[PDB]
Design a protein around this ligand. Structure first.
Ligand code: HEC
Ligand code: HEC
Ligand SMILES: [Co+2]
Ligand SMILES: [Co+2]
Lengths: 106, 106
């Protein structure tokens, strides 16, 4: 998988969670999102290839993935409690993370 | 001013930007929000009253204000460049910062 594949996995699984109505469905989708975010988390993206690894811009980009993963983890815990609607609300709140990183990068 | 005061300032001024009758109200509201966020960063939220100031919880709470201030500063720069519509568009995205911190700590 590459960055584009991981991003499509995140995109589609948000909608799977929206469409779902049970905890198993939400858990499975969040687990796939976690794997995609972890797969994309470590690579320096093309626009930052020439920046220092500890540069502010690279730091903020890496933290975007770290924080996204943290909130996926929190949503997964809600699904594992059987709290379907709370997990779905947490998943919808992930969109803020998506848009924030995209707005910085583009 | 206390944390409740700071949050009222943030709420009122975010809505001012959305409803701004003229462009100059946007910069004025962003300026007040910036100060409210830096004041709030010096408070302890009720749900974290029993936690160490070095807890992961207090660290993430304080950091949320630094990140909010960074995006307020980006919007202020747009306003100061005369790009007030772009600044108003940027201000609407600030709601993600409010929602993220609230889901943890409000
Ligand atoms: C940075 C820390 C990111 C986070 C968090 C998320 N995405 Fe992303 N996304 C990122 C990059 C570097 C790119 C490629 C360059 C570009 O500007 O497109 C993308 C791209 C996408 C795409 C494809 C283009 C598009 O239609 O927007 C999608 C569909 C996408 N990203 C989805 C997505 C979602 C749903 C996220 C949150 C769950 C998300 N991304 C987080 C960088 C980052
Ligand atoms: C953490 C980093 C926060 C950010 C960013 C924002 N808010 Fe907040 N808010 C936070 C806490 C911990 C609390 C609870 C305070 C309490 O004493 O109970 C709040 C509360 C509010 C409220 C309600 C205030 C009240 O009198 O009960 C409002 C209206 C509010 N917050 C608004 C608000 C807005 C609009 C923000 C973004 C611009 C925002 N807050 C950011 C913590 C944090
Ligand atoms: Co968080
Ligand atoms: Co940012």
């Amino acid at each position: 998988a590459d960055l584009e594949d991981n991003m499509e996995t995140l995109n589609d699984n948000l909608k799977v969670i929206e469409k779902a109505d049970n905890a198993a469905q939400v858990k499975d989708a969040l687990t796939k999102m976690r794997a995609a975010a972890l797969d994309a988390q470590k690579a320096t993206p093309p626009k930052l290839e020439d920046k220092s690894p500890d540069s502010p811009e690279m730091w903020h980009f890496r933290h975007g993935f770290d924080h996204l993963v943290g909130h996926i983890d929190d949503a997964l815990k809600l699904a594992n409690e059987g709290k379907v609607k709370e997990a779905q609300a947490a998943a919808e709140q992930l969109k803020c993370h998506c848009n924030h990183c995209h707005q910085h990068y583009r």
